[PDB]
Amino acid sequence: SGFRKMAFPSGKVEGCMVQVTCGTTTLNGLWLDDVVYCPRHVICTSEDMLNPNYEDLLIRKSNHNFLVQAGNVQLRVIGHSMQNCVLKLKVDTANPKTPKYKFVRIQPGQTFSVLACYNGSPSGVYQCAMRPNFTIKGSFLNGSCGSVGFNIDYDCVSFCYMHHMELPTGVHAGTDLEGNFYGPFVDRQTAQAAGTDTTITVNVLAWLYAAVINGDRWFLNRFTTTLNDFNLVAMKYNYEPLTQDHVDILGPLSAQTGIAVLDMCASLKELLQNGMNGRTILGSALLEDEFTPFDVVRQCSG
Amino acid sequence: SGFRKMAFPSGKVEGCMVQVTCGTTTLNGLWLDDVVYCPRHVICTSEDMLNPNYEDLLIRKSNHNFLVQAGNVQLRVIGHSMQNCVLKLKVDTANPKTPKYKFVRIQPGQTFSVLACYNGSPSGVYQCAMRPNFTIKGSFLNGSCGSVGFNIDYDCVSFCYMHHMELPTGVHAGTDLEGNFYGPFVDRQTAQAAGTDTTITVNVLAWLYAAVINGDRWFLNRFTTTLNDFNLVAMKYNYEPLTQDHVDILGPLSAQTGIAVLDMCASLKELLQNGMNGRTILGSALLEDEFTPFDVVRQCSG
Ligand SMILES: *[C@](O)(C(=O)NC1CC1)[C@H](C[C@@H]1CCCNC1=O)NC(=O)[C@H](CC1CCCCC1)NC(=O)c1cc2ccccc2o1
Ligand SMILES: *[C@](O)(C(=O)NC1CC1)[C@H](C[C@@H]1CCCNC1=O)NC(=O)[C@H](CC1CCCCC1)NC(=O)c1cc2ccccc2o1
């Protein structure tokens, strides 16, 4: 028993991290078979970071302008191309540590692990959720660009995120591995800012179920509610609408605990309307929304 | 910027996890050079788990009673011995993935990463702190025994924890890698329970500094306090006494923020006496105590 924000084991991804240098700009890349993926803004200079024309900037580069360092080994760049906001550097050596992998794009409200890296060297691993406004509440310092986010299923690494920038509120923005940004963000310095965010209702309910599975029951009640009355409350508190598909997804947890999904909704309504009256749930005084139903099932006993 | 509970990258430890089976009991072991370390209660039966004499139980075993599986490879056991509450199985193959390593024992209030494993297969990584009462608030299911806790410095893995059991309150107990239990716990079924716990004051103050570094300043004030008046408050709220050595350890963070340690103490006193009045700090509505000054410095900008 116990419930923690848990990341996937990072070994498979650690084997793929490298350092990419162009000019005086150094950041991280992801080495898979004979290709290194990295943010295209490695080719920028502090002189054209405001409105860069990346096609122009790239045309003025050649293979030898890119230095790729894997551990203490120089990888020779033998081709280069852009795909959306990522650069693909073809290298003359296939990474012998390449895992089975996939490039997936994730949905807001889904979670993934982030391997924070600096100069091609991993420093830490943590769990994140893609917020409804397509940002992530990460932990990223200068040098972290190129760090990736991923999930692991069986032997297979599904890469879902590459890190590009930090917004004025301290939250983070990046792309999928095809170089397409999550959200209405661009890789150029502008006044761009996070849009308004909302709470991921289905995840809060999953976490309430985790709490019950782990013996926190003080917020339960004999009441129930309909989906529509619940969603009237959800709207009032800036929670996302709960759909019937969410109810269905919560089915396993509902059956394991014997607490019907709409009964849990009655509990969440009471918590929203009354607060916690000084109590905690799984060690938190706030309602947590970064655990999916899958995260809860994977971590919690059967 | 950003602040997250971050674990060390787990790759180096993943390379050392194996499965150990004795009879119908299967758990995890840690393979380093030609030795596998695991909890000695792998030799117990549900028949003698109440008051086992491990010396007797071990004497009745031979090398062939232990099945060690590394991935899909059987490791031949060629010797066996007990050291306190851990078993050392000498195997005929040195682990080629052995990292530079050390066996350290940690202090209450220090943090470490846990690699949760089942059947020798890592499933997740997370950050923990050793509580003042020598327990850890982990996430461990049946099958997790033998999972380890560690820190990484440069290339060197300092193993500090092996997992043995769960206590009635849902918290966890284990040993260092020499098999000596953390706390007044024993590897036999008794009524044993966690003793009273306290909050790690120096870590709360480190986390307040992290909050300032990350732009949360609402809890600051123009006041100050002496160490003794602060500790009178600390005692009242079941916080650990703050020593001058703790003040010294907080020096870097104090200098980086320009907020004297005793001024931060004045802030913590106000938060203890008044609560948070509906506000949060680094996304928490509770005062967090599982980040050491080192964790904050390592993660936060310079
Ligand atoms: C990465 O480019 C990076 O790590 N580069 C390596 C070479 C050093 C950074 C990562 C940032 C750094 C700041 C702290 N957290 C973080 O995640 N990304 C940027 O610096 C990004 C770069 C621009 C350049 C054109 C393409 C993409 C954006 N810029 C910002 O994050 C950013 C935030 C502010 C705030 C105020 C003024 C400017 C600014 O830029
Ligand atoms: C490990 O032994 C383990 O994983 N063994 C592998 C072979 C299956 C478990 C880990 C526990 C399991 C329960 C849930 N969380 C967790 O961390 N450890 C135990 O089961 C431990 C074993 C005894 C045996 C003698 C030596 C050490 C203790 N027992 C307990 O954790 C425990 C908790 C309770 C509560 C009520 C009755 C009994 C009990 O046992």
From Swiss-Prot, chains A, B:
Residues annotated as domain Peptidase C30: 1-302
Catalytic site positions: 41, 145
Location of the protein in the cell: Host cytoplasm; Host Golgi apparatus; Host nucleus
Cross-link entry Glycyl lysine isopeptide (Lys-Gly) (interchain with G-Cter in ubiquitin), positions: 5, 90
Membrane topology (Cytoplasmic): 1-302
Taxonomic superkingdom: Viruses
Regulation: Inhibited by pyridone-containing alpha-ketoamides compounds 13a and 13b. In turn, alpha-ketoamide 13b (tert-butyl (1-((S)-1-(((S)-4-(benzylamino)-3,4-dioxo-1-((S)-2-oxopyrrolidin-3-yl)butan-2-yl)amino)-3-cyclopropyl-1-oxopropan-2-yl)-2-oxo-1,2-dihydropyridin-3-yl)carbamate) inhibits SARS-CoV-2 replication in human lung cells. Inhibited ex vivo by michael acceptor inhibitor N3. Inhibited ex vivo by compound 11a and 11b.
Catalysed reactions listed for this entry: TSAVLQ-|-SGFRK-NH2 and SGVTFQ-|-GKFKK the two peptides corresponding to the two self-cleavage sites of the SARS 3C-like proteinase are the two most reactive peptide substrates. The enzyme exhibits a strong preference for substrates containing Gln at P1 position and Leu at P2 position
Function: Cleaves the C-terminus of replicase polyprotein at 11 sites. Recognizes substrates containing the core sequence [ILMVF]-Q-|-[SGACN]. Cleaves and inactivates human TRMT1, preventing tRNA guanine(26)-dimethylation of tRNAs. May cleave human NLRP1 in lung epithelial cells, thereby activating the NLRP1 inflammasome pathway. May cleave human GSDMD, triggering alternative GSDME-mediated epithelial cell death upon activation of the NLRP1 inflammasome, which may enhance the release interleukins 1B, 6, 16 and 18. Also able to bind an ADP-ribose-1''-phosphate (ADRP).
Assembly description: 3CL-PRO exists as monomer and homodimer. Only the homodimer shows catalytic activity. Interacts with host FBXO22; this interaction promotes the proteasomal degradation of nsp5.
Protein's name according to its UniProt entry: 3C-like proteinase nsp5
Organism field: Severe acute respiratory syndrome coronavirus 2 (2019-nCoV)
Record lineage: Viruses, Riboviria, Orthornavirae, Pisuviricota, Pisoniviricetes
Residues of the full protein shown: 3264 to 3565 of 4405
